[model samples]
Target: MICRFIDTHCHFDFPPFSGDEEASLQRAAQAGVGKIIVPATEAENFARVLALAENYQPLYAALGLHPGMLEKHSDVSLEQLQQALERRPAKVVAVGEIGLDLFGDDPQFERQQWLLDEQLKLAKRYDLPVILHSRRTHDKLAMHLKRHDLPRTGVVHGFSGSLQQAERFVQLGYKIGVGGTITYPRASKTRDVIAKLPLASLLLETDAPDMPLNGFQGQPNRPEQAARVFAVLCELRREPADEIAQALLNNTYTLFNVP
Candidate 1:
C-alpha cells in the first residue's frame, strides 16, 4: 500500500543526510513519503538547499533566515537574501523556517520580531507563502502576519499551540503543521486540537533531525517518519485512512501550489 505523502517541513540539509540522499530517498519512498520541502535555516545554507532541490526531483526548497538562528543573521544577511530571491529559482517554494521564537530569554524578542517583519515583507513582495516557526509567540507571530497580509499565507510548522491559537491561524488563512509531537500519548492538547481542526487547514511534516517521534527519542528524525505521523493523525480523526491521507496531501498541494 503505497500512499503518496509530502513532508511539508524537513531539514534535509542537516546531518544524517549529507552523503546519503540516495539511500534516504529510497528509505523514505519505502515508507510512502514521496516529496519533501527543505527549508533553509540561514543564508549560509541557502546554496546547499537550492542545489538539493535542483538536483532532486522530489525535493523542494524554501529560503529564509530562521529567527532562532539570530546570531548567524545580520542587517547585511537580508540584503543577500533579497539578491538571492531576485533570481527566483524554480524550486524555491516559500520563504520559511522563519518566524518568532520566545523559547529562551537570550534570543532577544525584539530582534526576532524585526527579522520576522523583514522576511514577511520579502514574502509579500515575492508573492510567496511562508513557513513559520512559532514557539511561545503564536499571538505575536499572528499579529505580524496579519499586519502584512501576505497574498499566499503559509503554515505554522511543528505547531503545539492551543486550540484557540490554531483556530486563530486558520482564520488568518494559515495551515497547521502536524508532526511527531502528535505521536506522544501525553500530548493530549495538541492531539485533540489536531483531531478537531479542519482537515483542509492541516499539513503533515516530520521536522526531521529535530522533533523525533515517540519511540525515536534521542534519535535524529528522518523524512520517512512522516508516514508514522500520518498514521497517528488518522487515529486521532474520525475520517477513514484514505480520506485523511488525501486531504492532507491536498492541503500541502493547495498551500504550496503543487500539482
Candidate 2:
C-alpha cells in the first residue's frame, strides 16, 4: 500500500498552515504526500506563494487572481500576474487558483469571464498550465477554456458537477481535481463522476483549510488529508490502489510540470 501523492490544489499560504509550514509538511509527508502546489488567490499573495515554493523542496506555486475575489482584482493585479509569469521562476508551475464563479452574492459574471480571459492569455503566453476554480460556472468556464484552447490545459479543481460536465473538461484536455467531496457518501453525483472518469483525467487535492473530509467535519482540512481523499477515490474506482495512486501522481506531474 505504498503510494505517493501530489496535492495539486492546496491553499498552503493561508492561515493555520502559514507560519506552521514545516510541521504541516511533515504531517503530509507521513501520509505519503510528497509535494504540494500552493496557488495564489490574488496579487497580494503571489510573492508569498512563490516564496513557499522556492524555500521548500516539496512546494510549488501557481499565480493568478481567484474568481471569488472579483472586487479585489484590478488592472494592476493582472499586470502583477503577468510580471510574475514573465520572471518565470523555476518553482512556479502553473497560472492559477483562477476561474469563473457564479455562486457569490454579486457574481458580476461578465467581469469574472473577462478576468479569466486575461489570465488564460497569460497562461498561454507563459506556456504554463492552470489550476482553475469553478463554482456554479462549469459550462461557462468550459466555454472560456475552449475559446482560449491553452496548450497546457489545466485542472478544474474541486469539481462537483455532473458526469457529462466532467467529461467535457476531460474532452478539452483538462484534468479534474478529486478532492474531499467524494468522501461524503451523499455526494453520489460527484463520486460517480470520479469513479467513471478516466484515471488519467483525475488528480488528487485537499484544498486545505477547506473541504474537510466526511469524518473530519468541523476540523480544518490539511494537505495531509490528500491521503484521505486518495483513500476515498480508491473505494469508488475499480482500478487497483497502486494504479490509481500512480496515475493521479502522473497526471499532476504532467499538468503542473511538478518535479
Best by lDDT: 1
- TM-scores of the models, in the order given: 0.97, 0.97
State the displacement of the C-alpha of residue 75, model 2, in Å, after optimal TM-score superposition. 0.8
List, residue by residue over 70-144, the lDDT tens digit for candidate 1. Answer: 999987889878888889997999998899888775879998998999999999898899999999899999998
Show where candidate 1 strays beyond 4 Å. Answer: 1-3
For model 2, residues 40-112, the per-residue Cα lDDT tens digits are 9999988899999999999989999998888899999999999989989879999988998888568999888
- In the predicted model 1, the residue pairs found to clash are none
lDDT of 2: 0.91
Runs in model 2 lying further than 4 Å from the true structure? 1-3
